[PDB]
């Protein structure tokens, strides 16, 4: 096939596509000032698990 504004022969076919589980919103994270650990250092808080 001769496309437009390409000047190079090209072939277009049909292929099978399957989506995947990996998503950007499942690992994105940010933190300004959350709960602090007992010692005083910042630590992970379990709030996202309970929505």
């Amino acid at each position: 096939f001769k496309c437009e504004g390409i000047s190079t022969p090209l072939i277009i076919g049909e292929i099978y596509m399957v989506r995947l589980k990996h998503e950007p919103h499942s690992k994105f994270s940010a933190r300004s000032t959350s709960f602090m650990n007992l010692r005083g250092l910042p630590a992970k808080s379990k709030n996202f698990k309970e929505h």
Binding site: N37, L38, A43, K44, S45, K46
Partner: protein, 58 residues
């Protein structure tokens, strides 16, 4: 134990019986507050931990 003694009687058998009975009584008992020490370290050590859980409790 010594106050409860009788003349014309043995002593060693009495002592053995009372010691064994007290030992069994100590072994079989119902303590008020049950204890359960948390382990040295959680196996996963990533994104979850029993120590981490008891910390987020407080």
């Amino acid at each position: 134990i010594f106050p409860k003694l009788k003349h014309n009687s043995s002593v060693i058998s009495y002592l053995d019986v009372v010691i064994k009975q007290k030992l069994k009584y100590l072994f079989t008992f119902k303590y008020p507050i049950s204890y359960k020490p948390l382990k040295a370290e959680t196996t996963d050590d990533e994104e979850l931990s029993e120590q981490e859980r008891m910390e987020i409790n407080l």
